[PDB]
Design goal:
Layout: E1 4-10, H1 14-28, E2 34-40, H2 43-50, E3 56-60, E4 72-76, E5 85-89, E6 102-105, H3 109-118, E7 122-125, H4 131-140, E8 145-149, H5 150-155, E9 165-167, E10 181-186, H6 190-197, H7 202-218, E11 226-232, E12 238-245, E13 252-259, H8 262-276, H9 278-287
This protein binds the ligand *Cc1[nH]c(Cc2[nH]cc(CCC(=O)O)c2CC(=O)O)c(CCC(=O)O)c1CC(=O)O.
Family: Belongs to the HMBS family.
InterPro entries: HemC, Porphobilin_deaminase_cofac_BS, Porphobilin_deaminase_N, Porphobilinogen_deaminase_C, Porphobilinogen_deaminase_C_sf
Protein name: Porphobilinogen deaminase
Length: about 290
């Protein structure tokens, strides 16, 4: 019959479309009268959305801006995927087993600084590309390993054949939002917001909100050696781990805070780390990037 057709904007990568289709398939489980169509197309997707050219988009949370444009919102955060960083070694060695001088591919200062904090006798080498391109570069270029998000590999069904070691937060604190998706829509799209409600995972959303408040107060992002991971403890409180590192791994600011209110705990984590010197570090790193 004649039902509202929800237009879902997506990037064209294998991963982007996979995450988008995942979300659509989950929403279909409610069996409500909506049709979904993907429009293959964060700031451009946002402009299209404000213009009503699309109704929603699915992004990786770790790629979301600190402030959404007025009139848009994160209308849903589904159950988190794996939050962890993953090591993918060409010849199968765990992190501690890689040979002295092993070249590990990442363009993330957060990742590389944490690895250099554990081992001096490795090299961190820039790499770019979508996940599949990076895995090919590992094979065909001078890298001994790469770091990827476990979540991306999982979404694609590639983990089994790729991951050498899942990195616990104790040794690589994840990027804020890693493994979470942001489903963005118009703030006034009440019908779509109600559809999205059943997919929202409150324990994930509250943990990520804490992470995000911390990142925004620190003026962090993907280009900065900053990390934050929140989870819900068995008693119900949120625990937030916050980290800033020097690019060379020699200086590490790392704290844990526990509380009920994600805004209060994110803000406190930020204040704590800023008093210790982590904000000055961030500002200096930004001065020495292009
Ligand atoms: C902030 C940032 N973005 C990226 C690239 C990226 N974004 C999303 C993913 C998939 C995982 C997810 O959905 O959470 C990825 C790719 C990946 O991490 O596998 C990065 C990584 C840059 C790199 O390592 O070169 C970052 C920065 C960071 O994670 O610190």
């Amino acid at each position: 019959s004649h039902m509202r057709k929800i237009i879902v904007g997506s990037r064209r990568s294998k991963l982007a479309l996979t995450q988008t289709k995942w979300v659509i398939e989950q929403l279909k489980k409610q069996g409500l009268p909506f049709e979904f169509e993907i429009k293959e197309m964060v700031k451009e997707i946002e402009q299209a959305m404000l213009d009503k050219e699309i109704d929603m988009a699915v992004h990786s949370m770790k790629d979301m801006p600190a402030v959404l444009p007025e009139g848009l919102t994160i209308g849903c955060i589904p159950l988190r995927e794996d939050h962890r960083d993953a090591l993918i070694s060409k010849n199968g060695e765990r992190f501690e087993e890689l040979p002295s001088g092993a070249v590990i591919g990442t363009s993330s200062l957060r990742r590389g600084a944490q690895l250099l904090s554990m081992r001096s006798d490795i090299e961190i080498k820039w790499i770019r590309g979508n996940i599949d391109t990076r895995l090919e570069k590992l094979k065909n270029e001078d890298y001994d390993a790469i770091i990827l998000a476990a979540a991306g590999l999982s979404r694609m069904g590639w983990s089994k054949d790729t991951v050498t070691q899942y990195l616990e937060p104790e040794i690589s604190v994840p990027a804020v939002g890693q493994g979470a998706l942001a489903i963005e829509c118009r703030e006034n799209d009440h019908e779509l917001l109600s559809l999205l409600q059943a997919l929202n995972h409150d324990e994930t959303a509250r943990a990520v909100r804490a992470e995000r408040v911390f990142l925004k107060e620190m003026e962090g992002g993907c280009q900065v050696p900053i990390a934050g991971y929140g989870r819900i403890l068995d008693g119900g409180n949120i625990e937030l781990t916050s980290l800033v590192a020097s690019p060379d791994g020699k200086t590490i600011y790392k704290e844990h805070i526990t509380g009920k209110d994600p805004i209060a705990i994110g803000s406190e984590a930020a204040e704590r780390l800023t008093s210790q010197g982590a904000k000055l570090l961030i500002d200096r790193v930004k001065e020495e990037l292009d």
